[PDB]
Design a protein around this ligand. Structure first.
Ligand code: SAH
Lengths: 205, 326
């Protein structure tokens, strides 16, 4: 890294700075006087203080990026969010006053809940025993569960089964499926859990 | 003459009876196949062999019984397809007699190249030119490196001196091509002092040439008898009727293990000759078998009568493993 270990990561949070002094604790008062003597890394081009900043969608965009083409990756993302919103406005206008209350039209709420429905609680590890391989179940950390939900969704949309369908239509269709606990990605979660149940007797390895 | 090995046991074991259809995956000379068509005149039988000369014998012998014997040609792996063309995919074969090894005719005829004692082309190939591109033992020895050829001898020949007997072959081939049986035998002997030529002994305690383990090793790598034996047994099981008696004959340990580990479900990747002590040590580490698909008619391997061994020393090591499908 071109940053010496002395450089600290920047904290981009407007609220963190406007917080009054009186509310601060003696520990939080020390952290603030300390950072005034520390070197701070330049803020990356990715994240800003904008009110529309979403770290989860920004991460999903990077996991879709091919060969540093962020413009294309982000274009696909915003086209998916627009396709999700238009599909829900079409379902909303076609519904009755009672069903309309249950129809979600916010694509960020759908995107977040769609991924949370795909996160696998437990996973498997390929372990070797006596020249023979047997998988072992293990709890998954929070980072790993969130990463696997985004990798399974992107992998499913890149599958060759989809013929000539553009990515914003594929991803929007899969997100709305997972939002309703349906789809291939939800099945992958269920299969991983079901396999991790058939190997419970192998938890001692 | 070569009497069919353990013919009395194999006949009693399969108890051929009217209304039963049987298969024979190794017709060869046909001594066993004919002993089975004698007890039951109403029997139905199917034959198979890898040797076209053996398949011609069956065709010539088909005259004796027009339909009771049906001759087929091909390897164990190709047997299912050949029999699938007939359409007997379920098969419901009452018994499959999978005799193993080299035919008496194959190794009594010097031209076939199986006998080190005689002088024939170094073929050592059960195939009789049905596939003229199939490598012969001469090709195997002239091409493979010391490490590669040593493995053939070590794994298939049970030969301690695999590096010593393989280096001699590598040096000899460079000087001249290895194309005759005696030429190879002399090369293998030349790896050891001259007295070594007959130091080794068989279980019969009769002196054997010091290259009897290289002729067996190549014989099994040229004809891939071991890998073809696993598919051959598997195919028999699929084509074997429930309640049908299988009978194999293993003349050496490597084939005997596969038959034992197949009729008992034991994994083929387990360690050989495991003692009770080692079995305890193996499982103690993990602490931190599937239902059998066979019912062994005779629990322990049968063997030829000692008197019969002297009459037919070639079959001394015949280990008969009988089982009934489950
Ligand atoms: N993979 C294979 N598929 C088919 N036949 C094979 C084979 N490996 C060996 N054989 C043949 O099976 C026979 C075994 S030795 C001869 C036994 C025979 N019952 C007899 O009449 O003596 C030989 O003819 C050999 O060429």
């Amino acid at each position: 890294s071109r940053y010496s270990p002395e450089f600290k990561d920047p904290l981009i949070d407007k609220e963190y700075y406007r917080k009054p002094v009186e509310e601060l604790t003696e520990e939080e008062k020390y952290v603030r006087e300390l950072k005034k003597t520390q070197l701070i890394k330049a803020a990356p081009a990715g994240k800003t203080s904008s009110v529309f900043e979403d770290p989860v969608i920004s991460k999903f965009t990077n996991m879709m990026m091919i060969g540093g083409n962020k413009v294309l990756a982000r274009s696909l993302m915003i086209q998916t969010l627009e396709a999700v919103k238009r599909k829900q406005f079409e379902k909303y206008h076609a519904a009755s006053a009672e069903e309309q209350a249950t129809i979600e039209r916010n694509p960020y709420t759908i995107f977040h809940q769609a991924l949370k429905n795909c996160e696998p609680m437990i996973g498997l590890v390929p372990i070797l025993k006596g020249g023979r391989f047997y998988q072992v179940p293990v709890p998954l950390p929070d980072r790993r569960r969130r990463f696997l939900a985004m990798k399974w969704m992107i992998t499913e949309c890149r599958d060759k089964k989809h013929q000539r369908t553009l990515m914003p239509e594929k991803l929007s269709h899969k997100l709305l499926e997972a939002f309703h606990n349906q789809g291939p990605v939800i099945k992958r979660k269920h299969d991983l859990h079901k396999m991790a149940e058939a190997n419970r007797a192998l938890a001692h390895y | 003459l070569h009497i069919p090995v353990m013919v009395d046991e194999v006949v009693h074991c399969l108890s051929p009876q009217k209304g039963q259809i049987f298969l024979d995956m190794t017709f060869g000379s046909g001594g066993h196949t004919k002993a089975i068509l004698q007890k039951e005149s109403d029997i139905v039988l199917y034959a198979l062999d890898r040797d076209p000369t053996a398949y011609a014998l069956a065709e010539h012998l088909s005259e004796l019984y027009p339909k009771q014997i049906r001759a087929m040609l091909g390897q164990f792996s190709q047997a299912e397809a050949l029999l699938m063309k007939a359409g007997v995919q379920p098969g419901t074969f009452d018994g499959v007699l999978m005799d193993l090894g080299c035919s008496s005719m194959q190794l009594d005829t010097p031209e076939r190249g199986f006998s080190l004692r005689k002088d024939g082309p170094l073929d050592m190939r059960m195939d009789g030119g049905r596939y003229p591109d199939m490598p012969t033992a001469a090709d195997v020895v002239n091409a493979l490196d010391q490490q590669a050829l040593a493995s053939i001898l070590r794994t298939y020949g049970e030969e301690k001196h695999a590096k010593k007997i393989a280096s001699a072959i590598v040096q000899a081939r460079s000087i001249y091509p290895i194309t005759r049986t005696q030429q190879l035998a002399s090369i293998v002997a030349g790896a050891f002092p001259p007295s070594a030529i007959y130091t080794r002994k068989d279980l019969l305690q009769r002196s054997t040439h010091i290259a009897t383990k290289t002729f067996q090793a190549l014989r099994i790598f040229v004809n891939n008898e071991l890998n073809e034996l696993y598919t051959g047994l598997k195919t028999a099981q699929k084509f074997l009727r429930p309640g049908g008696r299988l009978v194999a004959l293993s003349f050496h340990s490597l084939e005997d293990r596969i038959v034992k580990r197949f009729l008992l479900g034991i994994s083929m990747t387990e360690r050989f000759n495991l003692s009770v002590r080692q079995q305890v040590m193996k499982t103690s580490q993990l602490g931190s078998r599937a239902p059998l698909m066979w019912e062994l008619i005779h629990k322990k391997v049968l063997s030829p009568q000692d008197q019969d061994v002297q009459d037919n020393p070639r079959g001394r090591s015949a280990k008969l493993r009988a089982a009934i499908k489950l």
